[model samples]
Target: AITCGQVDANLAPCVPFLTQGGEPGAACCSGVRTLNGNTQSSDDRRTACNCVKAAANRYPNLKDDAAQSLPSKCGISLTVPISRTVNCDTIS
Candidate 1:
């Protein structure tokens, strides 16, 4: 169940910060960390990368800068840059 959740559903809490341009709350950070923990599999990592790009597109405020900075802001390191234009296939 954990690996099968939609990208939006898992990281939706970060949307507020992405949209409104402010600090991510406790829940948002928790979600980010959770996402980081879930990157054990290459497929999962790639899926998460694509989902982040999709979310950036769906939310008006999720720009390149914001998406790029999210990992650092959330205090986590990701294999992908979380950008809209990045190739999801190379995430592994």
Candidate 2:
């Protein structure tokens, strides 16, 4: 039930990142990139959450949520690092 615009679950991807205000940054805009699950990096993924953490939110809800779910599915953790774009390869 997770609707992501025009993404095709069978062939689409999800690489969530952070914005300047701790808001879930646009997935295809600033601080955002496109990549398949196979190309997505645990390192970059971790940084995304880090970026959110660094945004300075008294609640830190976004960062906390992203960090909490880093592992298992993405194998990442709660952290804030330089924001970078990742290709995450492509779906052939």
Candidate 3:
């Protein structure tokens, strides 16, 4: 099974903007798209969303507006933006 480490690989690059407040540059958007490209099943989407929530908790001082705006900032659309509090189970 794919693990969250896969997530970190596809995700870590965005933390700079997710926390420190910078634009979600090209690299970051690439990662985000890959993360969401799964477009698989409801179950996968929910887990991906949940995994992202778990990932966000690892970092502190997450900008709510920043977190919520991640997908849009990256020109991608997720079931929800990108925040720890999203109802991952409700996704898809």
Instruction: Compute each candidate's TM-score over C-alphas.
Output: 0.46, 0.20, 0.48
lDDT, candidate 2, at 77: 32
lDDT of 2 by residue, 11-90 (tens): 12343332223434333332122243322354544443433333233225565655454332322233344458643222
Output the better candidate (1/2) by TM-score. Answer: 1
Clash pairs, candidate 3, are: none
- The TM-score-based order of candidates, best leading, equals 3, 1, 2
- In candidate 3 the C-alpha lDDT for residue 40 amounts to 68
User: RMSD per prediction, one decimal?
Assistant: 6.2, 14.0, 6.1
> Where does candidate 2 clash, by residue pair?
50-79, 50-80, 70-76
Best by TM-score: 3
Residue 68 of candidate 2: its Cα lDDT?
A: 53
Over the stretch 4-29, how does candidate 3's per-residue lDDT look in tens digits? 44445555666565555656575555
Model 3 accuracy (lDDT, Cα)? 0.52
Lowest summed lDDT across 10 adjacent residues in model 3 is found at 71-80
lDDT of 1: 0.51
